[PDB]
Design a protein around this ligand. Structure first.
Ligand SMILES: Cc1cc2nc3c(=O)[nH]c(=O)nc-3n(C[C@H](O)[C@H](O)[C@H](O)CO)c2cc1C
Ligand SMILES: Cc1cc2nc3c(=O)[nH]c(=O)nc-3n(C[C@H](O)[C@H](O)[C@H](O)CO)c2cc1C
Lengths: 222, 222
């Protein structure tokens, strides 16, 4: 009764509200890293900078789409890249949704894109020619624009899936926590799910990098 | 063919290996926050500091157990708190395992534990009387022990589930990234799954805070 439990619960509620938990009008954005397109790239005769999914990637996307089949989704967005579109299509096909495209969801520009050799940088050294703040801002505006183009769901939480690219996604999530490259020291697995909570222009990182739909899969799928 | 794709792929493989992705002999720790015990706590007739799960928490634990039913698990550990034990019991029984207890997984000591009203701190201000460094040390010890206690499984990835408490868990994961309280600025949802990848004495934060198994449930389940 008056034994500290009231103070504990009220403060917990206040903490939850800072992270948009227990707050009306919150939408969720499920950020999805595209599935594998690099197995076999050494022998690929298509555009090697815009490859289709590999056989392994098709299998990952099928596991992802099954995982998300039961989740109410109200929109699916993708970058213009084949690997993102193809992943998004697998997801959207379980929901009666059409994949909407936003080129601003593209991966960070890489040395590879510029036709230069790639180099392995030390931890914490930003490795891309497109600056981190520019990547973060185009991801932030692409995400809030996808929410603004999604009508609020009539029952419960509006949820938008956004299929993008692992480096640009982890840059977005770090920037949302006011962290620079290397501080949020993670790589997002292919087909991983990361959740943001969004209300008006405010965006909160709720979960990061979960590819647990692959946990029981054979090793040639991981 | 030798158009920059080979250096791109070689760098990519090296980056994956730094984060234990696609590396043989890696184990996983699934860090699980216990299920709800706070709904209705204001009227709870037992010990409010060590309560059983609520009706809502039992529903969350059921959804969590169903999520993990198809995931191979080779050990289940929990703190001694009833709410952690009850959350773990739902997971363990479906994998043919007894729940094992390690009190080093207990929640950070709170103002409530010390007889002071809970106080809402500004973001970034550490709110507990047990120092962060001490919480991180005992959590790392406990997880290291849970990994060491689990014999390698002969199929796929060896996996240990560890059911604990959200503040201690996010302290551990921040510490594993050499970050202090408030930098990894997240609260972990109840029944959320976070994953560490482990090989030798190296622990990598793989994923954080996923409670997507709750997304299809009724709204009174979160
Ligand atoms: C933490 C991390 C470190 C990275 N390091 C490099 C690197 O040093 N050089 C490079 O060309 N790409 C790097 N990348 C990109 C990466 O190797 C690969 O191209 C993409 O992650 C695959 O989608 C890195 C990405 C992340 C997330
Ligand atoms: C990011 C974060 C900030 C929190 N801030 C406080 C706080 O200011 N005061 C407090 O009593 N508990 C705080 N907590 C604990 C929280 O309110 C609650 O007691 C636990 O999360 C319940 O398991 C915090 C927890 C997190 C992870």
């Amino acid at each position: 009764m008056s034994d500290g439990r009231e103070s504990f619960l009220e403060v917990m509620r206040s903490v939850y509200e800072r992270y948009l938990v227990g707050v009306p009008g919150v939408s969720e954005v499920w950020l999805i890293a595209h599935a594998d397109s690099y197995t076999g790239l050494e022998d690929y005769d298509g555009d090697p900078r815009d490859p289709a999914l590999s056989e392994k990637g098709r299998a990952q996307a099928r596991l992802l789409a099954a995982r998300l089949a039961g989740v109410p989704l109200h929109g699916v967005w993708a970058s213009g890249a084949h690997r993102a579109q193809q992943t998004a299509s697998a997801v959207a096909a379980e929901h009666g949704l059409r994949v909407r495209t936003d080129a601003r969801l593209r991966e960070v520009r890489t040395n590879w894109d510029d036709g230069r050799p790639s180099e392995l940088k030390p931890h914490g050294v930003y490795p891309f020619p497109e600056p981190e703040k520019e990547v973060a801002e185009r991801m932030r505006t692409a995400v809030t624009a996808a929410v603004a183009a999604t009508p609020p769901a009539p029952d419960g939480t509006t949820r938008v899936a956004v299929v993008g690219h692992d480096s640009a996604l982890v840059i977005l999530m770090g920037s949302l926590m006011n962290l620079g490259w290397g501080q949020l020291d993670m790589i997002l697995p292919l087909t991983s799910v990361s959740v943001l909570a969004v209300k008006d222009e405010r965006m909160v990182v709720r979960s990061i990098g979960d590819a647990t739909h692959l946990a029981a899969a054979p090793s040639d799928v991981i």
